[PDB]
Design a protein around this ligand. Sequence first.
Ligand SMILES: Cc1cc2nc3c(=O)[nH]c(=O)nc-3n(C[C@H](O)[C@H](O)[C@H](O)COP(=O)(O)OP(=O)(O)OC[C@H]3O[C@@H](n4cnc5c(N)ncnc54)[C@H](O)[C@@H]3O)c2cc1C
Ligand SMILES: Nc1nc2c(c(=O)[nH]1)N[C@H]1C(S)=C(S)[C@@H](COP(=O)(O)O)O[C@H]1N2
Ligand code: HPA
Ligand code: MOS
Ligand code: MOS
Ligand code: FES
Ligand code: FES
Ligand code: FES
Ligand code: FES
Lengths: 51, 756, 151, 164, 164, 305
Amino acid sequence: DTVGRPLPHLAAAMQASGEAVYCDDIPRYENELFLRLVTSTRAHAKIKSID
Amino acid sequence: DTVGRPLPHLAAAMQASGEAVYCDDIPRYENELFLRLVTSTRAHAKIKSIDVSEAQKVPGFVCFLSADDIPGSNETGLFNDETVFAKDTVTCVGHIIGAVVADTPEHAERAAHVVKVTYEDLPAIITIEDAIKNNSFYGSELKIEKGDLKKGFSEADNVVSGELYIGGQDHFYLETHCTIAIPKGEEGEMELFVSTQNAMKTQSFVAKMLGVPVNRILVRVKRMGGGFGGKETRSTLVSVAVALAAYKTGHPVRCMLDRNEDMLITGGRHPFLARYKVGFMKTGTIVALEVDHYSNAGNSRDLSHSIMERALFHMDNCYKIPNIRGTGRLCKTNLSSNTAFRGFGGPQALFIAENWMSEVAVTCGLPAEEVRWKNMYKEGDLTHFNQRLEGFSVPRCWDECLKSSQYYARKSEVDKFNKENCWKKRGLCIIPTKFGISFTVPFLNQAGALIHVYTDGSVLVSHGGTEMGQGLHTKMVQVASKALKIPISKIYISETSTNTVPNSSPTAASVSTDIYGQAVYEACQTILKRLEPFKKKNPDGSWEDWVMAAYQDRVSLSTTGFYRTPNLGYSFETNSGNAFHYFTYGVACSEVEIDCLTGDHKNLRTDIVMDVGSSLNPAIDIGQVEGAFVQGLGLFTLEELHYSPEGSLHTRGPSTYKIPAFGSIPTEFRVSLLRDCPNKKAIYASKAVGEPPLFLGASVFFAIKDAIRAARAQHTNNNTKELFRLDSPATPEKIRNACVDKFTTLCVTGAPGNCK
Amino acid sequence: TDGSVLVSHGGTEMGQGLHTKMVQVASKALKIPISKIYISETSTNTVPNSSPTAASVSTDIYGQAVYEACQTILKRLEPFKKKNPDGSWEDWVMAAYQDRVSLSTTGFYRTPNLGYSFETNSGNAFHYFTYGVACSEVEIDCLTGDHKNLR
Amino acid sequence: TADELVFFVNGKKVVEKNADPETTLLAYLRRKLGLRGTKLGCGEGGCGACTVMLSKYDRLQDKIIHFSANACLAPICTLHHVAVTTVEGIGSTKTRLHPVQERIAKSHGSQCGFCTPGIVMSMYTLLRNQPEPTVEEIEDAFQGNLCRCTGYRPILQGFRTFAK
Amino acid sequence: TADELVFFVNGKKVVEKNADPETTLLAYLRRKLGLRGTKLGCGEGGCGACTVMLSKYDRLQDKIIHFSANACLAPICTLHHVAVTTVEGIGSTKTRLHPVQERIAKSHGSQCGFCTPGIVMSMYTLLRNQPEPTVEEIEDAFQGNLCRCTGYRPILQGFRTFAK
Amino acid sequence: PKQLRFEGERVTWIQASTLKELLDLKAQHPEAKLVVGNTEIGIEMKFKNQLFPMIICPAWIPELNAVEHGPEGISFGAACALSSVEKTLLEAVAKLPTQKTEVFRGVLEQLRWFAGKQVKSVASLGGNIITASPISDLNPVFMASGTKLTIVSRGTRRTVPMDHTFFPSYRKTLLGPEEILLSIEIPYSREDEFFSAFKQASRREDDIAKVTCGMRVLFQPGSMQVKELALCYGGMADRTISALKTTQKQLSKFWNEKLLQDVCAGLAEELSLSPDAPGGMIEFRRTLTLSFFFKFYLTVLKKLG
Ligand SMILES: Cc1cc2nc3c(=O)[nH]c(=O)nc-3n(C[C@H](O)[C@H](O)[C@H](O)COP(=O)(O)OP(=O)(O)OC[C@H]3O[C@@H](n4cnc5c(N)ncnc54)[C@H](O)[C@@H]3O)c2cc1C
Ligand SMILES: Nc1nc2c(c(=O)[nH]1)N[C@H]1C(S)=C(S)[C@@H](COP(=O)(O)O)O[C@H]1N2
Ligand code: HPA
Ligand code: MOS
Ligand code: MOS
Ligand code: FES
Ligand code: FES
Ligand code: FES
Ligand code: FES
């Protein structure tokens, strides 16, 4: 029974050793592509065209 | 409500478009490596050395893996009598010694070929006869006995004794064994994509070899390109190796076997040798039977004991025999370990039964159908293992098959053909079958499901069963849809996984529809109970309305379901307790024409009548009957494995191993499902269909044996009651050799000889 | 069937140590060491319709869900415990498996008595309140606007 | 100092600058082009799981010709100026299935589905050579394709609709 | 005739035959070498999530020098004959943790864990120059490392154990 | 159309555009391996783990693809696909009188349940011949019919009838290391000439012990008196063989029961297999050699009468 005990965060050791996997740490598939958002530079505007 | 409707297999369109993903179709990670097994070329030998010097010169070579590389345990297999990688000795020709890992499958292949092994040969045992002579068996004798054999034989008018052999069979699933193992690099975690019927054992065996808890290992199965029992246990041979490579390298690793590796390494159906003695009256009524069975089990136990148990349960076929003793022994040999194959010992035992029954009819000089009919069980009879036959439908199938196949009329036509033809002959036979439904191991008769309802009303079902082409997922969707009273378009099953339903039995024994159907049904009942208050408040609302009301009222929309088959547990020590939940029945009539000069034959017409209760899906069920029958046709007439005297398999691909082809099937091929025979014991009154029909393929074998009899009456002797041994499979060699004439004897040359 | 336990719950780990707490909870409830329990990830195919991991209540609510599921497991194991009282967790799990008792369960918790109305100013808005006090001392540099947090 | 290898796959040009003579078409399709509808069932010409259609302009006969082949045995180095059609070339559930794909699916001629692409390509090739075949030509079209699940009856019954 | 770039990463030789001047060390480590312990947190030098240790032979003061750097701003083209050390180069849960890794973990200095490798590398670098630092030197080592979770107290407390 | 060169990690491939280029290359590198359909070479590399560092592909060369109708028979370039051979022969059979198509009809019988459409569309005629498998279904037909082979190298050109001498040993042909097979002429049948071909309907070993045969008889004009007899068998030895001892004894004998007996006695002796012969099926194979001749014997009688 560890309830009430100061048990370290279970992933802490793997986090210190860089073994903990975060989303971008997942290996890429051979055919994996990459996305970048195109974003408004105006607070309020009609979009006339996109080139 | 689609239950009872011929809905196409849910993935059929995707399979026809090449969009359905099988294990090796999964995209590769950028860093993914490939594994190729290194395998023994000797039946029995000490390993003196393994030389990897030349393999290391192959571009893209990563490493060679052996037993020394295993972090946890090198002990594996169902009974812990196998190695992951052979250490000191090899005990069959495809015994896994190690593996090569490389950057491409071509490079892995190249490197594995250049690995040199040095051996010191040991005395090997290859044949059942070898094993018998050497007392080389796994465990002791299995036996079922009823009545008094001395006495039965005293009362008999005639006695016939003999010996029979039935060769094994390669599964020849179109998709060979395949595993991808992805190491996460945290806490021993690994995710595996596997072509397996047994995710639970895959998970267990991987965990054991790595020495990590089972909770670290996730096994996922979307679908298999065929299993037929061959992926029930032997899939772990590849899975465990790939997992070790993933562990050792820290990269994703995959392996898919080449056909020739798969045929050599993974095992097949058990060959059986039987020695039998039957006592009978001049009427054809059976009074005593004694059968000793021996299976060629190969170099580990695996499922061999349960297979032999199932064989002993089916040695009666459909016949009442008051004095009976069957025994079975498992031969321990230097051949790849044999395993489950559709029918699981049943087809072998049923073949042996039909063989002696055919000899009874010949010896009595009576029509075969008459002798079979006379000896058939009745409703409510006890089997040799004391189980009551409730709902015994063989008589109905028999009479329907006789009528619809026009047996008696065609029998006259076969006789007319044989009168008018000298070097070709026809044969015709009608055979019944019964097949016990349930795992022979009582604890495996359990099933789980997990159902989620999402807030748009869409439903995700997961169950312990795996899809291998039998249409299990389709049937489960039909069941869920009926149970919940919503369209099938609202229900989806994605895959089988160990993190959704744990501890699942292998998808096997033909009972998956029954047990997972029940588990899904129960989960569905829970959901319905939870939604009932919302339905009551809003009776003209939609499913979507009720689901959203439940969600907003904080009612859980996720549940497990579980089913355990009741009243099971046979005792070999009391010869009592139910071995099976119920029985599936069927009858098949087949006609053939043989070329007495070449041993070639044509399958002219087959009629099948099967009792499948009230079919959940007649299209899937008819497809199962046709498929099983053709595999049985292969077993008894086409498929032949051949080994060198040193125990090395010769037949390792489609060029040398012939499974049924488009051109092999009967010209007229008719299947009927019996009408108005609901099964009270299973989901929506249905019955298991996967395995029961395979033995009906033997109708072709016994039609061939009929034609041979006519050939022998033409050209060999004048003895109408002569018994000749015809082993299975009835290949052109066996058929030709059986047609003894002026050519086989060399009488055509002027020599004297043993023909007319 | 080795007795290792896999726990899934609707909550996500973002550094707050929720999975650690859930393992501590499960270990206490099951009366087995934390080394036997693992939480691998959060997924929509294990626990559907999950609330966001938010409002500081994940420990309270998933803790209760995990607790309830553990209680179900204990009830199912109880007969096997009584048959083998000097046996181990692993023996009891395998006996249960071989007797075809399910070793999988859901757990669910719904916070009671919540329902404030802005049109009546009544009904509980919260389950309970968390409280605290802080005392801080600073030194400011009146010529630069910089400050030091002293204590 | 090697030449470029140039062939077409489902209507799209492939330029392979470093063709290895050892590379099979099946390997190229699956592991370079990522077209995994075409399957490995044996690697020795017996099973037809890897069946594709090849087309070329035949300089002896003038004719454009269309024929089936086993991708497991075809070196890519034989394919300069040849067009390859795979199962994904003729139709899909995301556009429209070809009648060959529709028929086999709806006639219950696909169980595990592993042989289905190969059978689809054999039937497609026949129809591209003979828009109205006989029942006889149809059965003979499949000597090179094996199916372990179906017992063949439903595949033939489905495709018989194309005859006469 | 573009030159080879040669450097070392965790004791292992890297020969880049086709180095692009625009490539950062962080992109190289993560996306070519597959060493994902080093993190992108900003890409502008302010957060230290991408901290690695660099070592070189200093022709001037003779010695091998060790210093910390942001992999997100280091052009790989600056690294010819430099040795790179990352978090995976100092210890792991599979073999043995370095004291720095063990202490931050056990001291509750890691919550989400995203800044932890960078902070480990900052502390490791300090100890490689000064194996017995002062409390004052310890806090100074972390001016370029941000943590959003811990409030910093437990990290300083765990590393104070290295002082005197 | 020009010569192309492909270079692999182990193998160099040359795609030859003309016959002259091919003969030059073959003279430059006698050990260079020819590949047309790769249906044998692919298996050898994959399963028999052979390596051929130099490969030439002659499939583009006119000649080698040519089909020519001549006075004595139909000539096929050696690179002609078996499907093209089958098509051409099926047309010849439909168009010509039965008495001229006996050999064609035998070829077609051997092609009936041979592989699949996939294999027959790429497998060449010349490749089957030169592969020289003991169990080739075509070589016994070509041998029994005296099919003519045109064989060429830089400088040399010769035409030989295929006979027993063409297959000296296991998987070997009577070609020089620099020679290539250019074309194959399948003969028209003459008056009083009859032909049959048969094959075993089982195969159990990769390239041995499957019985296949070509059988030919030529009578003296308008009689049943044997002028020529040829019985050639695959699957009875390590190569395609002729039962020369047996057939030689039948010359000027009449087609009757006595000939049937003598041939059968001869075949049982000449083709006898040892108990330990590779491939086994010893009794079956002997029985087939005799039963096939019996079928031929009765067919010839129906064709005579
Ligand atoms: C599944 C399948 C089933 C088969 N069934 C049968 C069967 O039932 N009966 C039967 O008899 N055969 C059968 N075969 C064998 C088939 O007929 C031969 O493999 C084929 O004809 C070889 O031709 P290829 O163009 O593919 O030869 P390749 O593999 O390209 O070459 C074959 C050999 O011939 C040499 N060669 C090729 N052309 C020439 C040339 N013109 N001059 C000199 N040498 C040359 C090559 O160097 C090589 O040694 C089968 C093959 C397969 C794959
Ligand atoms: N298409 C297909 N049908 C098949 C198989 C298979 O692998 N593919 N396996 C057979 C075997 S061995 C069994 S036990 C049953 C298992 O499926 P069920 O329990 O869902 O009937 O399917 C049978 N039918
Ligand atoms: O009866 C069985 N027992 C165990 N495994 C099986 N697979 C098929 N049938 C069985
Ligand atoms: O029980 Mo089927 O997997 S042999
Ligand atoms: O409730 Mo915290 O996610 S703002
Ligand atoms: S994979 Fe079987 S023929 Fe190509
Ligand atoms: S559908 Fe499974 S092999 Fe044909
Ligand atoms: S990523 Fe923030 S300093 Fe480099
Ligand atoms: S632990 Fe989360 S940013 Fe530092």
